[PDB]
Amino acid sequence: AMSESVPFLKKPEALDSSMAGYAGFDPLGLSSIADIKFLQESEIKHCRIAMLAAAGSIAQDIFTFPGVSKVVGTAKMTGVHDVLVKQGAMGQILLWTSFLEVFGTIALLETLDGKRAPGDFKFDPLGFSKNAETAKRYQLSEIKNGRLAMLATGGMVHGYFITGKGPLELLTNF
Amino acid sequence: SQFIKPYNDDPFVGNLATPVSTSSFTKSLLSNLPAYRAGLSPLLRGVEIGLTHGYFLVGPFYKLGPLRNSDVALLSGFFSALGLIVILVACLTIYGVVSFEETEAKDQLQTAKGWRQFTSGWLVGSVGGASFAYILISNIPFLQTAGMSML
């Protein structure tokens, strides 16, 4: 019973192979401090927010919406946050994501109690996971892209703190 | 619900089962401290306690001692820590001489051999931790000030 990802460490006790995205990676023992289901809900939340953040970074390089260049002149990655707190955009997304978080808080309490799976909000309108063979593939895939997007979001915003270019402009102007 | 109950089911012992005394967090901390941790020889208990205590002893002597404004402040602070260590080891040894009868048991702290092991480990770890603190403060200018090098 050894960890798959870290061969010299004992396999984490709280963790199990039924979990999506499991690789046996908890060398510090944080799965015992906080409840594992809270940690999974937290991880999947972080995953989705950073997936949006990373794609938004890339797309805000690729194009901007009509009239956006009027309001944001030279601000690129996090400067647009600073100028659009003055405008109403940040207050708006903050208000509506906080609205969603209220029901997310109810759902987190529900999944702590045990009725709901972490990150499961029954949001499958296009019926991608109806077959259920894809569901498991989609579950593992979502966790992997989420982790990659967490690392990527950090690595782009820190590349922008260094150069000011932003992701695609950092790449094209080496 | 009530959070205060008789200690270890006994209403007539001189203790209470309060959250500070007997919660899960307290029991985890107490059970994992080197004095009480399972599977440790008394010498290893002495080493871990000594390393901790010797390391923090260096700092008050160095920052606030008589030679603090001299360039020998770290030297005087280490040697003052050493002097306190030697006096405390004398205190541990005389406690062991007068408190424990001589029996073969050596794996418990409260035996004559177990106390002598703990004292040996405590002296070695204490001088080791003081030496480590000396090395860290000697080399890193952040530690020489209170973090005041950044301003």
């Binding site: 870290v6 061969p7 010299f8 460490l9 060398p27 510090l28 | 020889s41 010498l43 290893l44 092991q117």
Partner: protein, 219 residues
């Protein structure tokens, strides 16, 4: 029960003949200094870890004398064998003032791996794991033919070469600390102190204070 390495001396009680790189050499009985079951295991992991780090250091000194990677020469200049450590640290945030994090990046990733090895050593000490010393499971190309631990002969090769590299890297470091030449110039310059390279004082100059007024100081 006498010892192989020293026939007249009595064999050290804690060491077992089933441990790689054992010739009965422990006159000071450092292996008996802790009564615990996993202290012998701890010391064996320590010896292997020190040996591997020394082997990298010995190889690094020889290669640095051979060549350097592109662009390094324009930053560090003419510094070799621990002077480059001080030179990088003079241009790094926190330790100095500059635009580099070369020693700091090494500290970061080596420290991440090394907290992982910390948990491995702690588990191995208390008997919670049936893992031997030095084995981290790292063997990507099959060299031990099915076991990452390797054969008895190859771990004996590893331990002896590690001990050799500890002695050698200590020698190379001190010969640089006084001649300033570096490994290949020192080994070429078998008459030495005759002409030496002007090299900076290290980050610990005090240790170079008995060389002048007490010890001869031929240089």
């Amino acid at each position: 029960a006498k010892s192989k390495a020293i026939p007249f001396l009595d064999a050290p009680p804690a060491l077992s003949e089933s441990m790689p790189g054992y010739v009965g050499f422990d006159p000071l009985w450092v292996s008996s200094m802790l009564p615990d079951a996993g202290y012998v295991k701890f010391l064996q992991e320590a010896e292997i870890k020190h040996g591997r780090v020394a082997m990298l250091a010995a190889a690094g000194a020889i290669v640095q004398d051979i060549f350097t990677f592109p662009g390094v020469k324009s930053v560090i200049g003419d510094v070799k064998m621990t002077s480059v450590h001080d030179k990088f640290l003079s241009m790094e945030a926190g330790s100095g003032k500059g635009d580099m994090a070369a020693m700091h990046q090494l500290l970061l990733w080596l420290g991440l791996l090394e907290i992982a090895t910390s948990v491995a050593i702690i588990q191995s000490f208390k008997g919670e794991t049936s893992r031997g010393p030095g084995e981290f499971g790292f063997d990507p190309l099959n060299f031990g033919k099915g076991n990452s631990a390797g054969s008895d002969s190859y771990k004996l090769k590893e331990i002896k070469n590690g001990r050799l590299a500890m002695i050698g890297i200590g020698g190379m470091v001190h010969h640089y600390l006084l001649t300033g030449k570096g490994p290949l110039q020192f080994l070429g310059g078998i008459p030495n102190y005759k002409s030496c390279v002007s090299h900076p004082d290290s980050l610990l100059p005090w240790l170079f204070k008995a060389v002048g007024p007490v010890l001869p100081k031929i240089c």
